[PDB]
Design a protein around this ligand. Structure first.
Ligand SMILES: O=C(O)CNC(=O)C(=O)O
Ligand SMILES: [Fe+2]
Ligand SMILES: [Zn+2]
Ligand SMILES: [Zn+2]
Ligand SMILES: [Zn+2]
Length: 407
DNA sequence: ACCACCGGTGG
DNA sequence: CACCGGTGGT
């Protein structure tokens, strides 16, 4: 209840002040002090974008040291003094899965998806004018998104598998059952590993996604009781333009596991290239977690908060909209950088890291790669989610069979 | 409003 | 190659 600004929700969760969040996260993660970093971010509502307008970052929150284990972005709600005055927006576990696992997933998923992977077009693959080339213009190499598990379907108002006699949640090109089983095993195993981390760090969101686990098990991933996830998307060097995951269930979240190219697996030192995760409607604070101006200035000079970097680069523009050859034009971010209130708070997720955010409510995006290449990607993101209305047994078979019966 | 959306099956 | 039809967002 409230009687006292951006989307309001508390399932990640929330408290009367920044200090309360620290207690909450210290309790959840188990460690105290340095291990947990909290950045205050400010919702401006003014979207950061290039002149074209594709995703851009204005600030990059980077892991400060090996000591930093948990990053939490918090939004202090303008004018509130209640028990949910400050809410958690993003949680990032730098050391999310074992590094040997992360190395092995990188290789295996890249190899499997490049040869047997089947494309999944998405509106967020393109800018508003549907004329950009953020993915790269080589069909064999361009960044791409692949969708697996279950997903919601307007045609059934439920799982897309409502008619499927034994559906293939991990359909690869053509036929090969053995390749699909191998891909299934990796992502099933990873789903299984990630659930307890999700329970631990975002229990309220985890609990919501678990409610109907026993009613619709056919629409859940994972091999062990506690199955919050329904679908997985693999994004290889994919530039996701600013969007919200509107199909996701209410009061849940998305877990994003990041895998990086081999030149970007050591703490510190720059790889080139690098893909960023962006909240285009936020700016960073004047002040650090505990309210010190000097402290936040130190982070800026040390690079824990990297202040970008207005650019003027050259890029491709398609002569005709994709609509569901090209010319060079130069892209600019001068205007987003002129306005202190135009947002673009980004994080640089590491190899093996796990990012938690309410992707349904928060506008978000990933930056385009300099030279996208899905066959040897700079970044692979593994995005775990549950869509709305995935609460019926057997992929909603009964419902549709019954709805068509009355006709 | 109203355009435009992380597919599948039978034929 | 053609039916099935929910709903946020500028
Ligand atoms: O790649 C991640 O950081 C973000 N992924 C998405 O926003 C998505 O595919 O819906
Ligand atoms: Fe998304
Ligand atoms: Zn673009
Ligand atoms: Zn309040
Ligand atoms: Zn299903």
């Amino acid at each position: 209840s409230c009687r006292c600004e951006g989307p309001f929700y508390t399932h990640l969760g929330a408290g009367p002040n920044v200090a309360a969040i620290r207690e909450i996260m210290e309790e959840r993660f188990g460690q105290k002090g340095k291990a947990i970093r909290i950045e205050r971010v400010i919702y401006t509502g003014k979207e950061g974008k290039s002149s074209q307008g594709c995703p851009i970052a204005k600030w990059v929150v980077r892991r400060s040291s090996s000591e930093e284990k948990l990053l939490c972005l918090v939004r202090e709600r303008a004018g509130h003094t209640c028990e949910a005055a400050v809410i958690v927006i993003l949680i990032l576990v730098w050391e999310g899965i074992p590094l040997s696992l992360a190395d092995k997933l990188y290789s295996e998923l890249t190899e499997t998806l490049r040869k047997y992977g089947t494309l999944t077009n998405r509106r967020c693959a393109l800018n508003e004018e549907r004329t950009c080339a953020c993915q790269g213009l080589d069909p064999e190499t361009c960044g791409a998104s692949f969708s697996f598990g279950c997903s919601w379907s307007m045609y059934y108002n439920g799982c897309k598998f409502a008619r499927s006699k034994i559906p293939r949640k991990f359909k690869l090109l053509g036929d090969d059952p053995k390749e699909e089983e191998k891909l299934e095993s990796h992502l099933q195993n990873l789903s299984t590993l990630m659930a307890p981390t999700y329970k631990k760090l975002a229990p309220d969101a985890y609990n919501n996604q678990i409610e109907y686990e026993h009613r619709a098990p056919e629409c859940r991933l994972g091999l062990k009781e506690g199955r919050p996830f329904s679908g997985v998307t693999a994004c290889l060097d994919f530039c996701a333009h600013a969007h919200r995951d509107l199909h996701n269930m209410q009061n849940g979240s998305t877990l994003v596991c990041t895998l990086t190219r081999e030149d970007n697996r050591e703490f510190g030192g720059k790889p080139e290239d690098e893909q960023l995760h962006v909240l285009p409607l936020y700016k960073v604070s004047d002040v650090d977690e505990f309210g010190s101006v000097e402290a936040q200035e130190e982070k800026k000079r040390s690079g824990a908060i990297q202040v970008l970097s207005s650019f003027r680069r050259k890029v491709r523009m398609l002569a005709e909209p994709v609509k569901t050859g090209s010319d060079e034009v130069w892209s600019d971010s001068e205007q987003s950088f002129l306005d202190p209130d135009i947002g673009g708070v980004a994080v640089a997720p590491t190899h093996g890291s796990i990012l938690i955010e309410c992707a349904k409510r928060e506008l978000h995006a990933t930056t385009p790669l300099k030279n996208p290449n899905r066959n040897h990607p700079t970044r692979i993101s593994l995005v775990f989610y549950q869509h709305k209305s995935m609460n019926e047994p057997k992929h909603g078979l009964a419902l549709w069979e019954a709805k068509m019966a009355e006709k």
